[PDB]
Design a protein around this ligand. Structure first.
Ligand SMILES: Nc1ncnc2c1ncn2[C@@H]1O[C@H](COP(=O)(O)OP(=O)(O)O)[C@@H](O)[C@H]1O
Ligand SMILES: Nc1ncnc2c1ncn2[C@@H]1O[C@H](COP(=O)(O)OP(=O)(O)O)[C@@H](O)[C@H]1O
Ligand SMILES: Nc1ncnc2c1ncn2[C@@H]1O[C@H](COP(=O)(O)OP(=O)(O)O)[C@@H](O)[C@H]1O
Ligand SMILES: Nc1ncnc2c1ncn2[C@@H]1O[C@H](COP(=O)(O)OP(=O)(O)O)[C@@H](O)[C@H]1O
Ligand SMILES: Nc1ncnc2c1ncn2[C@@H]1O[C@H](COP(=O)(O)OP(=O)(O)O)[C@@H](O)[C@H]1O
Ligand SMILES: Nc1ncnc2c1ncn2[C@@H]1O[C@H](COP(=O)(O)OP(=O)(O)O)[C@@H](O)[C@H]1O
Ligand SMILES: O=P(O)(O)OC[C@H]1O[C@](O)(COP(=O)(O)O)[C@@H](O)[C@@H]1O
Ligand SMILES: O=P(O)(O)OC[C@H]1O[C@](O)(COP(=O)(O)O)[C@@H](O)[C@@H]1O
Ligand SMILES: O=P(O)(O)OC[C@H]1O[C@](O)(CO)[C@@H](O)[C@@H]1O
Ligand SMILES: O=P(O)(O)OC[C@H]1O[C@](O)(CO)[C@@H](O)[C@@H]1O
Lengths: 741, 741, 168
């Protein structure tokens, strides 16, 4: 499908995830039949050429997906800004016959890449004029096609929801903050944490929202006049009302209303002078730029590298240079100069003190997170004091994020003047009573904890519905917020279907999907799946290290997830697994033979290892012991085989930064929707929710949040296998199988 | 066994590991029959009293062993320095009837504790004089017994080889450095890393030795005059000869010869000015003081807390106040003022510019590590150029530390002028040839990698001994350094026993024990066990979180280790497991019933969970499925049961800081012993090693290193079960069973 | 003796391809009037492809056409009372072994004491192709597999061709 060349380089500030992008670009370009060249040291080696350019095979990008930084350098170059350096770069690409180029890096590197494209013809004309190349070569390679990848932890680029490497930078930040909180709480100390982000407050905002920071400095929303007094009032209020520690986040580009930089040293000196609290200041530094890439960064970098190869091979000289980005939760493709110009316009608006215009230019998601953070940081005194009463349940298996969602929902409801209850042990508790009212401080510190503080059970309500109705009426509960997995969806569906027989069940209900398996209908991501993929990825990386030490070995790894093969699929992409057997992709004995012979062929190469994943219920008969025996027998003499069963390690320890924020956002938004419906269905002195629109599942669809009615989802649900009919992530299996030889 | 009270507090700078110490002190004091009181906020709450003192039960210190910092505060106090505050403290203890006190903290807190003891009688006399207490109470509580625990990351206290919390501080430091190395290598940047350590260079030295830092600043060995030129020469040499990055460690108390502090900013400005390298500076800050405690800190804190309770209950008023410390690898007990005075004398000698006297006062281990670091940092030009030739093998299963030991041994041998070979795939390789000569740069960057770069196999030599002898003679190999597990010991024993039949096997041999199971005879710790305990501890902590979320659940976790129950025992101590079934402790069906009924009793309390560990070969019949069925059946209605099998995740990812340093030290020391014997057995123009003293196992005994002959160990080895007869760690099982109800 | 469609045996090594070939023959036979099947498996014919393995393979690749079950003939195969042949065969071997024993025992008697040291004094009575023979125990050592506990060459491997022929 190709008879042309690809070049790839990384430039600008490195970010952990570039290695996965280089691997995917290389292996997709080889799969399509194109020659791939690795260009070392970025634009410096592009200009210098020679040994800096070398052809890559399938094994050149092997054993790098789990590594941070980049294996091909990404040094900075000054000569490429000049036309002399650019013609030398064009000459080097022509000498190696490279007509396509992939650039991984921030706005500056992509700007230089398009300037290189925009005059490629004139550079070839000059090279022909001086006699470096012949006319036939100039006519053959007369054009240059560019595809851009945005690798940066800052996440400032406008056309992309997530730049390659920002999720892992959040992982490094939260590792640091989780370390600080122990000693800060121990000694009752304030801390000023300086986070990177060149002129952007994304990292600071997300980390503050995930850590429950007591104050935040971001350049997009500079603090108002006399902010020192308001800071001192808040910090005095927290440390007075039971908050043992205070955390202050401050971006490295934070400013006042006059655009003047606010230093972390100033913040320290202010809190000492005006409150006397013992305090410290930590600059996290270049820890954010390194470490292993998180699971989402590897999956995204692989998807974007594949898409970039498709763009380079399907582009034409009339087509403008493009970047590959996120919109919603899919791999869209945008033109490079539009995104470069929009980012520059945002920066100029922020520089011109038009902070409202800069905020409206970036997107409203930042403002919504900023308002959610301010809402949940401190207790605003409520005034509504509605007669409404709520209960919050955990149902299903525990997931990392339940505690974050419960904290968010409880505090939002207390802010709205409701009496909030929490149920211990789910529907089983609500049958057995076990209902207690909860306050603002009763849920403090839950954001950073995995598992379930309330307790969760798989029990469903129809067997104890008389007791459930009794407790609903005793406590006067007017709405339920059931955060959990498929069992939560089933339970709310049973309560809705029993509304005719029982009048007290005429009650508003919302379901927050929270399970590792990602099997609840009505959402793309369930709260807790990201933590589980990261845990499984870490375990499988250790297994690959064990296998590579004991050369000529293959591993069969069993993942959790029921009949849903999401967790095995994305894990296998994240760790370069040679196969992932899944219920949604039926496989017979012939496919197992075909995989065994590929493993035999791979054992002839330098990479003498293997790893195949198996969902815990992908096949009735061909279990993990079956695959062990088959692989051991047909691979006798070539390799040996071992099995691993990742049990409840896949539920993970502490939640990732995404699960913390995702749970917090879902708790707020579900509570807002709950309050709106609850005041809508109030008539003639009593609540009466009977329409199917009053029982819904909050979930993040392809674009944004939606509240699908629980009964409407019934026609798109598999109650036998406990998962939806149609799942968005089946497209990723083609990339998984492609990246494996 | 007791009718008296215990008080416990944490003071000074907190360190991750204090929580395990408080748990062990509390649970041992309750086990012995004493009342235990938790004293909050350290000496501040001791003076203040009232709510700061409260009686603790078995559940007060539950679910804290995996937490950093301390749950009881440890604030600083100024009033306790005055006699008015000390009499108030004595009055509070008398009001609660406390006559014993445990203090966890550095030198200052322990100094204040003994001053409190030294005048307890006079404080009671003053309290009686003012009428606060009666004469009978003063006569009953007339004395105060003190036991001290040294909690500090600095590791400056003289009487202790490891202070509580320093291993975990190294874990935090190496997490940071492992993050930095990716971006530093990517961009070719120098880095200046400022580590804590008040006036001590232990943290900086160990971290530099574990990270392969290119330069180190410690106060114990200040740099000589004109050190700037020597620094520039070294850093220019590294970055010229293939070392893509440079790392500079600098303690926060580093100084010059004139005692004047050297700032990290100065080091940055110097490298910029004199070399032009792009560079950065990172202050790690209070990240070192927090995070989860490592496995060794939990085990040590538990041992020291137990021993402190024994000291408090077996002490008498003539007995001086004591501290519990490390000597060798056992829990010794020393008098408090001797250690306080020795630490002050070291600090005074270092302040008086008597750096040699301060070095000789601390101990020679620091100097040996300092010389090992300087030896291995850069290549000193050799001059001996002996005719000797070496080979280095990996045998057994891969362990985290093999790569560190190989790097250390290779570079030491190249420094001694030997021609060094490395064998790929162990004895199987040496039979199949696969021998290559290795240089200084050929082993660069291996220090931070787990697994095995050379490759390891379980093959033993007697089946291919003709081919092994052939390759030994072809390459002229005059010594072997076989780093591996029990299979390495077996193989070297077979080569020694075959010396009569084959003359070329008259060759010097050394065995570096490297395996997760800790089953090689002749050592207390095998290289790679610490990484495996940490990995298993992390996995079991996640399992306990899953179990606590799903209330009323018990887990059966299967650990690796063959017939050796070390890994299960120390893991179970580190994660508070209710039982650990081990081959060395035979158990029948009655013991399983007894454990099941204890689990039933524990399920009545607030902690409704359970965790029992099972070594993979502790019982022929009662396998893990057997225990699952038994626990599920006899606990029906009270709890449910699940099983986990920690497979090759227990081999771990990257090695811990201890495994890196331990492997590096063993590689140097084994190579030194190898060179000494090799020049000893050289006579009449040929090497001829035939005595049993020429084939040995390097290992860390109770005190220090020893080289036991391989044949002498045969009478203390179990070749059926592959482990020694007598093992030092069977004493820890009593502590394990005690800490579990 | 029972017309089994297959008998998996250590002396006839079989891989996954042979199991597929037998499964498709079973599928073809299920189209006829005789809708049944029976495959035998020696207890140690394969290290990996155990009886549970064959169960799972046959159940999966024959899904919709037939189902599968497993049986383990344990120590029922040691039988109850002996057959008429075993009674007579044991009786004859006891007589003949005793006759040979008495002959050698009076042969090796010399100077007032028994002294049997030649390898011919330790033998195995057995019915060879034609008639009885007394092979010395040490002479048989070069024709014995002490790992698998059986002789090198066995006369009954010819019967496997008839077994496979009588099955379609
Ligand atoms: N306008 C430009 N023209 C040519 N090259 C450019 C231009 N802008 C940036 N570059 C090149 O991009 C490289 C690094 O980009 P830089 O902006 O410094 O970092 P980042 O990728 O994070 O934005 C530089 O080496 C430079 O040669
Ligand atoms: N926890 C916080 N962190 C950072 N900024 C905050 C925080 N809380 C409030 N602010 C900002 O300080 C100002 C005062 O807070 P505000 O929400 O306006 O209180 P009010 O309800 O009186 O209007 C606002 O501009 C707000 O954005
Ligand atoms: N760790 C992650 N796992 C899965 N998807 C993610 C992750 N991080 C970001 N995303 C996706 O990119 C988007 C970035 O989220 P963000 O813009 O910060 O806030 P919001 O989700 O409210 O719009 C997310 O909506 C999500 O679709
Ligand atoms: N000589 C002393 N007399 C009485 N109390 C002391 C003395 N030295 C230290 N303390 C007490 O020890 C507490 C903290 O000890 P400090 O030296 O500051 O930290 P560290 O434990 O790390 O050495 C202080 O609150 C102080 O009251
Ligand atoms: N990698 C290093 N890090 C820190 N100090 C070093 C390092 N290498 C050498 N030094 C110190 O700098 C001085 C010069 O190095 P040295 O080992 O004495 O070289 P030489 O072989 O010429 O004597 C010594 O005091 C040494 O302790
Ligand atoms: N992570 C660990 N695991 C097991 N034992 C340890 C660990 N760390 C320290 N120790 C023990 O405490 C001692 C501290 O070692 P150190 O004094 O720094 O150097 P050396 O081992 O050469 O004497 C070690 O010898 C060891 O016995
Ligand atoms: O499939 P769900 O209900 O969404 O939850 C997933 C969890 O359920 C499990 O089946 C575990 O079940 P148990 O906790 O009852 O043993 C795993 O697939 C996984 O840990
Ligand atoms: O017992 P050793 O040889 O010291 O190493 C321990 C490892 O060896 C093992 O036996 C694993 O063996 P395999 O890798 O061959 O499956 C486990 O007990 C454990 O993972
Ligand atoms: O390593 P450098 O050159 O100091 O880069 C610092 C910048 O890196 C970034 O991550 C983007 O390159 C920014 O956050 C930061 O300002
Ligand atoms: O948090 P503080 O008070 O600044 O303590 C700093 C000191 O803590 C320590 O870890 C010991 O208390 C030292 O390393 C450091 O100098």
């Amino acid at each position: 499908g190709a008879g042309k060349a690809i070049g790839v380089l990384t430039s600008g500030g490195d970010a952990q995830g570039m290695n996965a992008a280089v691997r995917a670009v290389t292996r997709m370009g080889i799969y399509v039949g194109a020659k791939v060249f690795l260009i070392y040291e970025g634009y410096e080696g592009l200009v210098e050429g020679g040994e800096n350019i070398k052809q890559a095979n399938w094994l050149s990008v092997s054993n790098i997906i789990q590594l941070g930084g980049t294996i091909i350098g990404s040094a900075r170059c000054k000569a490429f800004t000049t036309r002399e350096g650019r013609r030398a770069a064009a000459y080097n690409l022509v000498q190696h016959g490279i007509t396509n180029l992939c650039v991984i890096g921030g706005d500056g590197s992509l700007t230089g890449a398009n300037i290189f494209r925009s005059e490629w013809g004139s550079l070839l004309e000059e090279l022909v004029a001086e006699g470096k190349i012949s006319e036939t070569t100039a006519r053959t390679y007369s054009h240059l096609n560019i595809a851009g990848l945005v690798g940066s932890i800052d996440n400032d680029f406008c056309g992309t929801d997530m730049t390659i490497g920002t999720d892992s930078a959040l992982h490094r930040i939260m590792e640091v903050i989780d370390a600080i909180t122990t000693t800060a709480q121990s000694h009752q100390r304030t801390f000023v944490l300086e986070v990177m982000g060149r002129h952007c407050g994304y990292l600071a905002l997300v980390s503050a929202l995930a850590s429950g920071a007591d104050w935040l400095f971001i350049p997009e929303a500079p603090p108002e006049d006399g902010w020192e007094n308001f800071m001192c009032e808040r910090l005095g209020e927290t440390r007075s009302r039971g908050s043992r520690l205070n955390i202050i986040i401050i971006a490295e580009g934070a400013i006042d209303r006059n655009g003047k930089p606010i230093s972390s040293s100033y913040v320290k000196d202010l809190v000492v002078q005006r409150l006397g609290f013992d305090t410290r200041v930590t600059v996290l530094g270049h820890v954010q730029r390194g470490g292993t890439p998180s699971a989402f960064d590897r999956i995204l970098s692989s998807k974007m590298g594949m898409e970039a190869v498709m763009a380079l091979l399907e582009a034409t000289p009339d087509t403008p240079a493009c970047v590959v980005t996120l919109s919603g939760n899919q791999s869209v493709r945008l033109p490079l100069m539009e995104c470069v110009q929009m980012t520059k316009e945002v920066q100029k608006a922020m520089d011109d003190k038009r902070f409202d215009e800069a905020t409206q230019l970036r997107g409203g998601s930042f403002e919504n997170n900023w308002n959610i953070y301010k809402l949940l940081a401190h207790q605003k005194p409520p005034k509504e004091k509605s007669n409404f009463s709520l209960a919050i349940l955990n149902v299903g298996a525990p997931a990392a994020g339940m505690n974050a969602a419960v904290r968010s929902a409880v505090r939002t409801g207390i802010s709205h003047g409701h009496t909030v209850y929490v149920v211990h042990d789910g529907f089983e508790g609500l049958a057995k009573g076990q209902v207690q009212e909860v306050g603002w401080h009763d849920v403090a510190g839950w954001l950073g904890r995995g598992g379930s503080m309330l307790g969760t059970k798989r029990t469903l309500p129809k067997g104890q519905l008389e007791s459930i109705v009794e407790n609903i009426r005793i406590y006067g509960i007017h709405a339920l917020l059931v955060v959990g997995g498929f069992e939560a969806y089933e339970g709310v569906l049973q309560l809705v279907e029993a509304r005719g027989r029982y009048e007290e069940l005429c009650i508003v209900m919302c379901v927050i999907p929270a399970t590792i398996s990602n099997n609840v209908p009505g959402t793309d991501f369930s709260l807790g799946s990201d933590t589980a993929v990261n845990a499984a990825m870490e375990s499988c990386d250790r297994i690959k290290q064990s296998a590579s030490g004991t050369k000529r070995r293959v591993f069969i790894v069993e993942t959790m997830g029921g009949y849903c093969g999401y967790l095995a699929t994305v894990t296998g992409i994240a760790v370069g697994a040679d196969a992932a057997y899944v219920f949604e992709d039926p496989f017979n004995i012939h496919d197992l033979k075909v995989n065994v012979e590929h493993m035999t062929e791979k054992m002839k190469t330098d990479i003498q290892r293997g790893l195949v994943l198996r969902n815990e219920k992908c096949h009735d008969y061909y279990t993990t012991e079956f695959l062990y025996n088959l692989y051991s027998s047909e691979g006798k003499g070539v390799f040996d085989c071992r099995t691993n069963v990742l049990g409840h390690l896949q539920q993970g320890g502490a939640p990732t930064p995404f699960d913390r924020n995702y749970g917090t956002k879902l708790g707020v938004k579900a509570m807002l929707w709950l309050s709106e419906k609850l005041r809508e269905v109030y008539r003639k002195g009593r609540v009466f929710a009977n329409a199917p629109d009053s029982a819904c599942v909050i979930g993040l669809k392809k674009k944004a949040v939606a509240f699908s009615p629980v009964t409407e989802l019934k026609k798109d649900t598999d109650f036998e296998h406990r998962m939806p009919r149609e799942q968005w992530w089946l497209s990723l299996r083609l990339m998984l199988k492609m990246l494996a030889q």
